[PDB]
Amino acid sequence: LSDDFKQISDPKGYLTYSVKYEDQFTKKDKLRASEADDRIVGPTVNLFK
């Protein structure tokens, strides 16, 4: 009847983190942690270089 709701898998928020790197350090080496945890920690760390 009232089709009001659209299915989605990974939802985004109306807010997020925006960092600005002082490209002086950082290395760009995209830090390599474990594999299992690369995925859990995964992005947060990549973002917070």
Partner: protein, 99 residues
Amino acid sequence: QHVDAESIMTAPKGKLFHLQFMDGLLRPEPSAFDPPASGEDMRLIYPLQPISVARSMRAIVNHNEVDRPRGAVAPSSYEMDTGTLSRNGDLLYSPVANG
């Protein structure tokens, strides 16, 4: 950028110019020996109210001398408090010793 004061001073009462401050804290301390340079660099327009509100984390680097680099934020105990989810559906912060 460089909002030229010509206009910051006299431009329509609307116009929304995007001036832009610098964030010197990760600035490199000039080599302890090298000879000086000679123009002081200044800024002739300061925001009249506390800016940077979205800045919730500042200076992610670690000074070598003094543990806490000169004034650095470090996320508040909320940007990670993931409480529960009220029965009614209003997600509410973890309790506080039985509150």
